[PDB]
Amino acid sequence: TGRPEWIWLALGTALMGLGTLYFLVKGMGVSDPDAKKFYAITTLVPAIAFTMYLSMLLGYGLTMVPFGGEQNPIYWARYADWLFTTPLLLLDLALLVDADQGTILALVGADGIMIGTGLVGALTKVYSYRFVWWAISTAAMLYILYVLFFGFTSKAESMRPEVASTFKVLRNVTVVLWSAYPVVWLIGSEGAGIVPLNIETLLFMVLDVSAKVGFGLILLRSRAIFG
Amino acid sequence: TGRPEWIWLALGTALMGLGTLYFLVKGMGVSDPDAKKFYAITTLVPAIAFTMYLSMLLGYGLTMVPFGGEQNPIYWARYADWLFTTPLLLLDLALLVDADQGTILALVGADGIMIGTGLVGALTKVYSYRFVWWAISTAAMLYILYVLFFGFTSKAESMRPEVASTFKVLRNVTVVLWSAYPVVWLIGSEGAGIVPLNIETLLFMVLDVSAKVGFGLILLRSRAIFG
Amino acid sequence: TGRPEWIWLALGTALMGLGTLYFLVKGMGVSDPDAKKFYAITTLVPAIAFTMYLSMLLGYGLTMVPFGGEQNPIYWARYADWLFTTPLLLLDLALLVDADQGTILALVGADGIMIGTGLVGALTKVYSYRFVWWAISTAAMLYILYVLFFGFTSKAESMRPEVASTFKVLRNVTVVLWSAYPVVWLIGSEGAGIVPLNIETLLFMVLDVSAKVGFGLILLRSRAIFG
Ligand SMILES: CC(C)CCC[C@@H](C)CCC[C@@H](C)CCC[C@@H](C)CCOC[C@@H](CO[C@H]1O[C@H](CO)[C@@H](O)[C@H](O)[C@H]1O[C@H]1O[C@H](CO[C@@H]2O[C@H](CO)[C@H](O)[C@H](OS(=O)(=O)O)[C@H]2O)[C@@H](O)[C@H](O)[C@@H]1O)OCC[C@H](C)CCC[C@H](C)CCC[C@H](C)CCCC(C)C
Ligand SMILES: CC(C)CCC[C@@H](C)CCC[C@@H](C)CCC[C@@H](C)CCOC[C@@H](CO[C@H]1O[C@H](CO)[C@@H](O)[C@H](O)[C@H]1O[C@H]1O[C@H](CO[C@@H]2O[C@H](CO)[C@H](O)[C@H](OS(=O)(=O)O)[C@H]2O)[C@@H](O)[C@H](O)[C@@H]1O)OCC[C@H](C)CCC[C@H](C)CCC[C@H](C)CCCC(C)C
Ligand SMILES: CC(C)CCC[C@@H](C)CCC[C@@H](C)CCC[C@@H](C)CCOC[C@@H](CO[C@H]1O[C@H](CO)[C@@H](O)[C@H](O)[C@H]1O[C@H]1O[C@H](CO[C@@H]2O[C@H](CO)[C@H](O)[C@H](OS(=O)(=O)O)[C@H]2O)[C@@H](O)[C@H](O)[C@@H]1O)OCC[C@H](C)CCC[C@H](C)CCC[C@H](C)CCCC(C)C
Ligand SMILES: CC(C)CCC[C@@H](C)CCC[C@@H](C)CCC[C@@H](C)CCOC[C@@H](COP(=O)([O-])OC[C@H](O)COP(=O)([O-])O)OCC[C@H](C)CCC[C@H](C)CCC[C@H](C)CCCC(C)C
Ligand SMILES: CC(C)CCC[C@@H](C)CCC[C@@H](C)CCC[C@@H](C)CCOC[C@@H](COP(=O)([O-])OC[C@H](O)COP(=O)([O-])O)OCC[C@H](C)CCC[C@H](C)CCC[C@H](C)CCCC(C)C
Ligand SMILES: CC(C)CCC[C@@H](C)CCC[C@@H](C)CCC[C@@H](C)CCOC[C@@H](COP(=O)([O-])OC[C@H](O)COP(=O)([O-])O)OCC[C@H](C)CCC[C@H](C)CCC[C@H](C)CCCC(C)C
Ligand SMILES: CC(C)CCC[C@@H](C)CCC[C@@H](C)CCC[C@@H](C)CCOC[C@@H](COP(=O)(O)O)OCC[C@H](C)CCC[C@H](C)CCC[C@H](C)CCCC(C)C
Ligand SMILES: CC(C)CCC[C@@H](C)CCC[C@@H](C)CCC[C@@H](C)CCOC[C@@H](COP(=O)(O)O)OCC[C@H](C)CCC[C@H](C)CCC[C@H](C)CCCC(C)C
Ligand SMILES: CC(C)CCC[C@@H](C)CCC[C@@H](C)CCC[C@@H](C)CCOC[C@@H](COP(=O)(O)O)OCC[C@H](C)CCC[C@H](C)CCC[C@H](C)CCCC(C)C
Ligand SMILES: *C/C=C(C)/C=C/C=C(C)/C=C/C1=C(C)CCCC1(C)C
Ligand SMILES: *C/C=C(C)/C=C/C=C(C)/C=C/C1=C(C)CCCC1(C)C
Ligand SMILES: *C/C=C(C)/C=C/C=C(C)/C=C/C1=C(C)CCCC1(C)C
Ligand SMILES: [Xe]
Ligand SMILES: [Xe]
Ligand SMILES: [Xe]
């Protein structure tokens, strides 16, 4: 049920908020139109995360879904977050590597299906079908990471060393972090309740902050964002 | 009610999936950044259609709406599909003809209102109002087809013969197919139940596959997508 | 409750519709691709407003929310409207002033959070929390107006006099009008019921038409939209 994890939601709300404030108070006198895009994209990520986490702490983003043989607490707000949030992170990577519009669109579409599909899964009443949606969603994710790791790295090789290396760190961090989400989902309250909603919220919390604030820090503090 | 049409939903899911796989396995070694956009846009259409159709087969995208004087089964998932799907098809046409940003925006907006409006209609409890929404939606569609047929054809005349002719076929196919949707809606379970939900799902199924996979095949197999 | 304000909804529906028709019947023979964008963006605003207002008149966009100690009537359709509508207006201003992509993205994101946040607030069951969302939403708005008034005006100074001055009028009108929305919300049925839903709907109606049709008239009737 939703009550004991309140603390992980509260620390998450706090961390996203401060992460937003810090980024805002760092790109203020930035004139380079390129760095400007990066700060805008990167500042918005934690800001959206902030609002959704707060809706979870306040209980608004929690819903109850009947499946298996009981009433399960499903925090839907995560998808609302990730829906805009994951595409933004991808965009940062695309700008850094100067990706083709076509691949950016394919990536954004793949990302949309990933979250949309995972949302349908977390809300499906037929326990067994939830995992079908999980598989489709995970397939979409693998497609995204495949392009990031192999297609983007290649595009990064044509940029100057600062960009290429900062991209490498960002690439490694997103590939590692993103792939932890589906596993958490599968073993948490949205799938096989192996892990309690308590510990689950703590995992997502560490993953989200790292994937946003951490990712944000690595990027916004490198010279890579400058033309 | 929703059970007998299961087969049309299943074949639709299958056809969209295979259509997605085929397109994916055809634009793999494509380097031309132009063709790349077309494959990305065109591959995403059937992929989204795939997920929504599956939600209908699995019963998730079906809801019940009280109107007239009974409980009517309304597959809402179609709008979720068409919401992203119809705009994408329009974009393919715009890229092919190299449309102005302003007209692309007007077209996307008109398309958004068309599906949004039709969604409101399919879910409205006052039987008589459903048709008001239908009219507004149909008006938006007519605006889109008017621009495609007269405005776009003109823009196509300035491209090389392969583009102009492929555009012509695509234009004719979308104008004919798209206009069948409102009629089906009006005579099906969403409006006047003249046609059973059974036969309706079969019509949309033929229309959707043609309008996506068929449209996709005609486009992706022509040299028109190359610069 | 929702019944007596029906007239403000009906006049609003009428005014948005005629405002859409007028704009459509004014940008018909416009060839300048720049003016074309402005007409497209500006025509879509009242069109969307039209559909949402009609959903409110017809009772579809009204929902009931329990909070405080009673059943309150909340017209949710406003957010659906403003969600696409406010960003479009911002885009008109950005195009006029030729804003950086980064600031356009930050503005669109800030706007999304503003409406998304206000929507969550209008639907939150814990009376006290509604105002938290209100504050966050108002903070997002202030961020937008700050950039419009100080950042954009500066960008406008680099354009020719017709653009700079038309921008000034548009700037003043949006800053004044937009800031009236949060106050209305705070004293209306969504917050402290100081003002009845009757009078509230009349205020939003005057604000919406001015902010869209009025804004639209000032812009589309100046030479500022031409390159
Ligand atoms: C790219 C962009 C950023 C992505 C944004 C997508 C977003 C904008 C789309 C909005 C789309 C719009 C057209 C759809 C509107 C649907 C609306 C009418 C309602 C939908 O409701 C379903 C929702 C989830 O709601 C469910 O959970 C809540 C909370 O827990 C419940 O309150 C609600 O009731 C739930 O609804 C489901 O169950 C109801 C069930 O009642 C059941 O009745 C049956 C009868 O047999 C049984 O009795 C059931 O059993 S039982 O438990 O009691 O035992 C009983 O429960 C149903 O009535 C409801 O109909 C429903 O099934 O779904 C969310 C769907 C998401 C949004 C779909 C996303 C679609 C796709 C993946 C998008 C891909 C994006 C693509 C990548 C874009 C590409 C282009 C780019 C620009 C590049
Ligand atoms: C461009 C882009 C791709 C398009 C994406 C648009 C998408 C992102 C928007 C999300 C928008 C967001 C701000 C709105 C959130 C609304 C939220 C609070 C809930 C909304 O619910 C209404 C939904 C449908 O839900 C309905 O169906 C489900 C399933 O069947 C039901 O479970 C649900 O309850 C239904 O809700 C309606 O009825 C409820 C009724 O209870 C009633 O109470 C009355 C009391 O008098 C009576 O008792 C009724 O009678 S009775 O039957 O029992 O006899 C009883 O039923 C109400 O309480 C609910 O409030 C509701 O009325 O609506 C979907 C709306 C859609 C999304 C609107 C789209 C808006 C517009 C067309 C978009 C244009 C896009 C434009 C083109 C963009 C341009 C810019 C581009 C970038 C270019
Ligand atoms: C940028 C673009 C244009 C913006 C578009 C955003 C849009 C596309 C997003 C769609 C997102 C999707 C992933 C989320 C789907 C959620 C879905 C599953 C259902 C969500 O439901 C919640 C809705 C509102 O619904 C509520 O109102 C209706 C009508 O009045 C109700 O019918 C419905 O039931 C309500 O739901 C709430 O309450 C239910 C409660 O039941 C409760 O149970 C508890 C148990 O303890 C108590 O018993 C309660 O008490 S009591 O009253 O009876 O006494 C009892 O009520 C819950 O079950 C439900 O779960 C729910 O809490 O929420 C709308 C959320 C909005 C859309 C979030 C927006 C997110 C963020 C701000 C977006 C920022 C955008 C950013 C700027 C983009 C940046 C990138 C750009 C490209 C630049
Ligand atoms: C705890 C919180 C998380 C809770 C708050 C709720 C929150 C979720 C909602 C807030 C809205 C939020 C979504 C906003 C995100 C904004 C973020 C994306 C911005 C990124 O930033 C992008 C820049 C774009 O820059 P520019 O204007 O174009 O400048 C051009 C210059 O003139 C050089 O030109 P040249 O190249 O030709 O030489 O934003 C514009 C630059 C401006 C000119 C300068 C702006 C300065 C700021 C207004 C001040 C910084 C903020 C404050 C320290 C406090 C923040 C309070 C909070 C309530 C907003
Ligand atoms: C049955 C199914 C429908 C069910 C699955 C669920 C499904 C709904 C969800 C899946 C996600 C789906 C939304 C993904 C859609 C992707 C689609 C839009 C892609 C269109 O494709 C666009 C390209 C962009 O190309 P590039 O990377 O930029 O290459 C540049 C090159 O180096 C030349 O450069 P130069 O010009 O300078 O010379 O995608 C990138 C090109 C890559 C470099 C190569 C990628 C190869 C693929 C990973 C392999 C093809 C797929 C496999 C046969 C099987 C598919 C499995 C499925 C589970 C994903
Ligand atoms: C009461 C109503 C509110 C209720 C109706 C419901 C409503 C909510 C839904 C309707 C859909 C609505 C969303 C549509 C909005 C459209 C709006 C955004 C359009 C803005 O307009 C943008 C232009 C783009 O122009 P272009 O086609 O690219 O022209 C290029 C030219 O050849 C020069 O080229 P050069 O530069 O190289 O020299 O639209 C294309 C220009 C076309 C070529 C000309 C089009 C003309 C129109 C079809 C006729 C005008 C409309 C009618 C008077 C009546 C309207 C009826 C209503 C039902 C649609
Ligand atoms: C979602 C799933 C179902 C679908 C997966 C798609 C996959 C089957 C097809 C992938 C095809 C592409 C590689 C196309 C060929 C492109 C050609 C130019 C050949 C190059 O391909 C070679 C390498 C990239 O080059 P280098 O690493 O040497 O630098 O691909 C590296 C390829 C590596 C080895 C494969 C990617 C490995 C993923 C992580 C394995 C996914 C399978 C999981 C074990 C399934 C788990 C499900 C369980 C729960 C049932
Ligand atoms: C949605 C409805 C309500 C609104 C429709 C809008 C309509 C009334 C206005 C259209 C205006 C534009 C034509 C503006 C004039 C532009 C000028 C340059 C004149 C050119 O106009 C001439 C031609 C295009 O040129 P060519 O075909 O010769 O190459 O337009 C070809 C015009 C053709 C003849 C009209 C388009 C025909 C549509 C399909 C008919 C819609 C009416 C249906 C019969 C209503 C059904 C409703 C029932 C169920 C109540
Ligand atoms: C949402 C709230 C909580 C957060 C507000 C953010 C704010 C605290 C920080 C603003 C920081 C920026 C000004 C950053 C500094 C940039 C430097 C170059 C210095 C320039 O700053 C000077 C001027 C702009 O220049 P000119 O007017 O002289 O031409 O800013 C003009 C600054 C003016 C004076 C401030 C903007 C005034 C707003 C309207 C006041 C908001 C506070 C309300 C009274 C709170 C109401 C809440 C109640 C209900 C509890
Ligand atoms: C700030 C948030 C980030 C970086 C979120 C990333 C989320 C994912 C990669 C989620 C993936 C999921 C699946 C692959 C399948 C099951 C459900 C999800 C949505 C958890
Ligand atoms: C892949 C799907 C396609 C090409 C769908 C096209 C759909 C339309 C043109 C739908 C139009 C409708 C109306 C004009 C009015 C009534 C309701 C709709 C949504 C069925
Ligand atoms: C056509 C509509 C326009 C220009 C709408 C503008 C709306 C706003 C600026 C709304 C702002 C709000 C807040 C700042 C807080 C509380 C709730 C809102 C959504 C009313
Ligand atoms: Xe992207
Ligand atoms: Xe388009
Ligand atoms: Xe904007």
Side-chain angles (χ1 to χ4, degrees):
Chain A
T1 185
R3 175 80 249 300
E5 66 283 10
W6 74 274
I7 184 179
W8 300 132
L9 304 180
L11 184 62
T13 293
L15 295 177
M16 291 303 184
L18 291 178
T20 305
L21 292 176
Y22 173 64
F23 292 153
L24 278 179
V25 180
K26 172 170 163 42
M28 292 196 304
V30 179
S31 51
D32 183 44
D34 276 51
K36 181 188 301 302
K37 302 164 192 168
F38 288 115
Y39 270 104
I41 295 158
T42 315
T43 299
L44 273 175
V45 169
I48 296 170
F50 167 70
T51 69
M52 290 303 88
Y53 259 91
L54 173 57
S55 71
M56 291 198 280
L57 183 61
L58 300 186
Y60 181 80
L62 201 191
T63 196
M64 294 293 210
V65 181
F67 65 72
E70 44 192 55
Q71 274 293 53
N72 319 266
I74 304 298
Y75 280 112
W76 58 266
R78 294 182 189 291
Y79 309 93
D81 177 326
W82 307 338
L83 185 62
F84 297 106
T85 252
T86 46
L88 282 171
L89 268 4
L90 253 27
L91 197 53
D92 260 329
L93 271 12
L95 301 194
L96 194 49
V97 102
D98 181 27
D100 290 317
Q101 291 190 189
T103 142
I104 291 174
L105 178 69
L107 270 297
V108 169
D111 195 299
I113 290 177
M114 181 183 77
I115 306 295
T117 260
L119 174 57
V120 170
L123 301 178
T124 292
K125 301 150 208 54
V126 177
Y127 189 66
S128 186
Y129 298 159
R130 297 173 73 83
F131 299 104
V132 170
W133 294 112
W134 175 91
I136 295 169
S137 181
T138 302
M141 183 197 80
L142 289 179
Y143 175 82
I144 292 169
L145 306 185
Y146 177 88
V147 173
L148 295 180
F149 200 80
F150 300 109
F152 274 40
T153 304
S154 175
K155 211 92 178 193
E157 242 88 65
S158 64
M159 298 296 298
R160 69 185 139 90
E162 291 174 3
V163 173
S165 62
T166 306
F167 174 62
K168 294 271 213 296
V169 176
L170 289 159
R171 181 200 63 184
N172 295 343
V173 165
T174 87
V175 168
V176 173
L177 291 181
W178 283 42
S179 51
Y181 284 79
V183 178
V184 172
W185 194 101
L186 191 71
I187 67 180
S189 48
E190 297 87 347
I194 307 174
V195 175
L197 174 53
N198 171 243
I199 300 299
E200 201 195 330
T201 309
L202 183 266
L203 291 175
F204 277 141
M205 198 259 260
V206 176
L207 251 23
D208 288 344
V209 176
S210 298
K212 296 176 162 71
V213 179
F215 176 113
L217 286 161
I218 301 174
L219 175 69
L220 294 177
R221 301 183 82 242
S222 72
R223 278 297 252 69
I225 62 168
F226 287 102
Chain B
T1 185
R3 175 80 249 300
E5 66 283 10
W6 74 274
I7 184 179
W8 300 132
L9 304 180
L11 184 62
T13 293
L15 295 177
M16 291 303 184
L18 291 178
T20 305
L21 292 176
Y22 173 64
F23 292 153
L24 278 179
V25 180
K26 172 170 163 42
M28 292 196 304
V30 179
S31 51
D32 183 44
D34 276 51
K36 181 188 301 302
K37 302 164 192 168
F38 288 116
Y39 270 104
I41 295 158
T42 315
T43 299
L44 273 175
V45 169
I48 296 170
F50 167 70
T51 69
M52 290 303 88
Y53 259 91
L54 173 57
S55 71
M56 291 198 280
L57 183 61
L58 300 186
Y60 181 80
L62 201 191
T63 196
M64 294 293 210
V65 181
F67 65 72
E70 44 192 55
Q71 274 293 53
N72 319 266
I74 304 298
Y75 280 112
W76 58 266
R78 294 182 189 291
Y79 309 93
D81 177 326
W82 307 338
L83 185 62
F84 297 106
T85 252
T86 46
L88 282 171
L89 268 4
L90 253 27
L91 197 53
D92 260 329
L93 271 12
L95 301 194
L96 194 49
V97 102
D98 181 27
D100 290 317
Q101 291 190 189
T103 143
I104 291 174
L105 178 69
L107 270 297
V108 169
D111 195 299
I113 290 177
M114 181 183 77
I115 306 295
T117 260
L119 174 57
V120 170
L123 301 178
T124 292
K125 301 150 208 54
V126 177
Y127 189 66
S128 186
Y129 298 159
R130 297 173 73 83
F131 299 104
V132 170
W133 294 112
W134 175 91
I136 295 169
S137 181
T138 302
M141 183 197 80
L142 289 179
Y143 175 82
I144 292 169
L145 306 185
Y146 177 88
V147 173
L148 295 180
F149 200 80
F150 300 109
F152 274 40
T153 304
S154 175
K155 211 92 178 193
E157 242 88 65
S158 64
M159 298 296 298
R160 69 185 139 90
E162 291 174 3
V163 173
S165 62
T166 306
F167 174 62
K168 294 271 213 296
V169 176
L170 289 159
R171 181 200 63 184
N172 295 343
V173 165
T174 87
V175 168
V176 173
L177 291 181
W178 283 42
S179 51
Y181 284 79
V183 178
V184 172
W185 194 101
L186 191 71
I187 67 180
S189 48
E190 297 87 347
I194 307 174
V195 175
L197 174 53
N198 171 243
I199 300 299
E200 201 195 330
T201 309
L202 183 266
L203 291 175
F204 277 141
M205 198 259 260
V206 176
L207 251 23
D208 288 344
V209 176
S210 298
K212 296 176 162 71
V213 179
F215 176 113
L217 286 161
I218 301 174
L219 175 69
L220 294 177
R221 301 183 82 242
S222 72
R223 278 297 252 69
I225 62 168
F226 287 102
Chain C
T1 185
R3 175 80 249 300
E5 66 283 10
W6 74 274
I7 184 179
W8 300 132
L9 304 180
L11 184 62
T13 293
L15 295 177
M16 291 303 184
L18 291 178
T20 305
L21 292 176
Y22 173 64
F23 292 153
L24 278 179
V25 180
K26 172 170 163 42
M28 292 196 304
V30 179
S31 51
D32 183 44
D34 276 51
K36 181 188 301 302
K37 302 164 192 168
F38 288 116
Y39 270 104
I41 295 158
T42 315
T43 299
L44 273 175
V45 169
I48 296 170
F50 167 70
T51 69
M52 290 303 88
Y53 259 91
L54 173 57
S55 71
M56 291 198 280
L57 183 61
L58 300 186
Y60 181 80
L62 201 191
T63 196
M64 294 293 210
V65 181
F67 65 72
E70 44 192 55
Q71 274 293 53
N72 319 266
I74 304 298
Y75 280 112
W76 58 266
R78 294 182 189 291
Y79 309 93
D81 177 326
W82 307 338
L83 185 62
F84 297 106
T85 252
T86 46
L88 282 171
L89 268 4
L90 253 27
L91 197 53
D92 260 329
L93 271 12
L95 301 194
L96 194 49
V97 102
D98 181 27
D100 290 317
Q101 291 190 189
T103 143
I104 291 174
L105 178 69
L107 270 297
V108 169
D111 195 299
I113 290 177
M114 181 183 77
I115 306 295
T117 260
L119 174 57
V120 170
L123 301 178
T124 292
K125 301 150 208 54
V126 177
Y127 189 66
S128 186
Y129 298 159
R130 297 173 73 83
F131 299 104
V132 170
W133 294 112
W134 175 91
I136 295 169
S137 181
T138 302
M141 183 197 80
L142 289 179
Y143 175 82
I144 292 169
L145 306 185
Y146 177 88
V147 173
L148 295 180
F149 200 80
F150 300 109
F152 274 40
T153 304
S154 175
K155 211 92 178 193
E157 242 88 65
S158 64
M159 298 296 298
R160 69 185 139 90
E162 291 174 3
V163 173
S165 62
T166 306
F167 174 62
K168 294 271 213 296
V169 176
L170 289 159
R171 181 200 63 184
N172 295 343
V173 165
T174 87
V175 168
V176 173
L177 291 181
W178 283 42
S179 51
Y181 284 79
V183 178
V184 172
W185 194 101
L186 191 71
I187 67 180
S189 48
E190 297 87 347
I194 307 174
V195 175
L197 174 53
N198 171 243
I199 300 299
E200 201 195 330
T201 309
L202 183 266
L203 291 175
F204 277 141
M205 198 259 260
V206 176
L207 251 23
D208 288 344
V209 176
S210 298
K212 296 176 162 71
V213 179
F215 176 113
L217 286 161
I218 301 174
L219 175 69
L220 294 177
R221 301 183 82 242
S222 72
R223 278 297 252 69
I225 62 168
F226 287 102

